[PDB]
């Protein structure tokens, strides 16, 4: 190709969008933004698909041009805007607030939060280093660059960021013994506790994690995102508290729930 591609064909769209294969030839093609477009959830799907607030393409545009939807504290009128993990979507007109979090099956879910727990987010640091005139600054994994961080915050750690003041308010030091929610691979959605980290010089670091219900698993460093200090997490969990289960467990769940109805 002689340049950038602007269409996303529906069969090539991410599998966790759950777009149906006969519903057209194209998919929304998330615009560039603070998330990598293969791990984001555009606003078209948040409004039209999940929340069923709109029935068509153009209805979503009619919603956005009216400045209702607010993403992480600012009003975003772009229709394919790449909202992502741990963002907040707010509709003040309905006074309703959602944190984007994973479910155990690896798909984004809009977990309702309160207005208290919507003025802040958590963000993992990509790196820390100096800038022009010796000023230190840190990178997040969603584009944000903060200058003059606490000189302790190192790479791969977590920070709490108030949306009002837009500065840090606390942080978690990435290390063994903290709760972490996996954001990639087959284990995405599963929360757990860091039990082991094994280094490998020249390759990816691997993390070994143990769920609260005992199930043990592992991932690589880039796919782990600490939530809280100690066993208690700092943010709300969705319908399942990040606990993966076998297919037989949910078969039992359906049939056992089929006797009360």
């Amino acid at each position: 190709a002689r340049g950038l591609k602007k269409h996303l064909k529906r069969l090539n769209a991410p599998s966790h969008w759950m777009l149906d294969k006969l519903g057209g030839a194209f998919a929304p093609k998330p615009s560039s933004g603070p998330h990598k477009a293969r791990e984001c959830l555009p606003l078209i799907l948040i409004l039209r698909n999940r929340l069923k607030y709109a029935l068509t393409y153009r209805e979503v545009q009619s919603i956005l041009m009216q400045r209702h939807i607010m993403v992480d504290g600012k009003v975003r009128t772009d229709k394919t805007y790449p909202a992502g993990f741990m963002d907040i979507i707010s509709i003040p007109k309905t006074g309703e607030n959602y944190r984007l979090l994973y479910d155990t099956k690896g798909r984004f879910r809009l977990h309702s939060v309160r207005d208290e727990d919507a003025k802040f987010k958590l963000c993992k640091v990509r790196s820390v280093q100096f800038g022009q005139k010796g000023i230190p600054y840190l990178n997040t994994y969603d584009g944000r660059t903060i200058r003059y961080p606490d000189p302790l915050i190192k790479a791969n750690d977590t920070i709490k960021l108030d949306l009002e003041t837009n500065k840090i308010v606390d942080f978690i030091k990435f290390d063994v013994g903290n709760v972490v929610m996996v954001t990639g691979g087959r284990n995405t959605g599963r929360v757990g506790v860091i039990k082991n980290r094994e280094k490998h010089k020249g390759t990816f670091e691997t993390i070994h994690v143990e769920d609260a219900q005992g199930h043990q698993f592992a991932t690589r460093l880039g796919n782990v995102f600490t939530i809280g200090k100690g066993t208690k997490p700092w943010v709300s969990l969705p319908k399942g508290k990040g606990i993966k289960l076998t297919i037989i467990e949910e078969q039992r769940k359906r049939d056992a729930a089929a006797q009360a109805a």
Binding site: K52, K93, T94
Partner: protein
């Protein structure tokens, strides 16, 4: 005797209306016309104006005596004019239509000045 029975029904303040699935039952009838559906719906939802009501995508289930479709109740005439497509308003009688002819629709206008 026809009945009306709406489901999956939710009021949104973003587009200032309420959406629902109509599941009219008409034992003995062929099907319910959308105008009569409009009228009947007005007197369960008391709309003061039977022009903000829209119905579409009706199926008439195999075997008869049952029809489903989608229903929109607005709260203004203004909201229905901004939040509804033109052809739907034309169907409800709030607008008028035009046509096209594609040669010289732009082609020879390109080339004079």
């Amino acid at each position: 005797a026809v009945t009306l029975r709406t489901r999956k029904f939710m009021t949104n303040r973003l587009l200032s209306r309420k959406q629902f699935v109509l599941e009219v039952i008409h034992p003995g009838r062929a099907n319910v016309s959308k105008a009569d559906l409009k009228e009947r719906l007005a007197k369960i939802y008391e709309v003061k104006d039977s022009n903000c009501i829209f119905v579409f995508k009706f199926r008439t289930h195999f075997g008869g005596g049952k029809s489903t479709g989608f229903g929109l109740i607005y709260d203004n005439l203004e909201a229905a004019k901004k939040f509804e497509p033109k052809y739907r308003l034309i169907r409800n009688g709030l607008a008028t239509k035009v046509e096209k002819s594609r040669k010289q629709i732009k082609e020879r206008k390109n080339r004079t000045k």
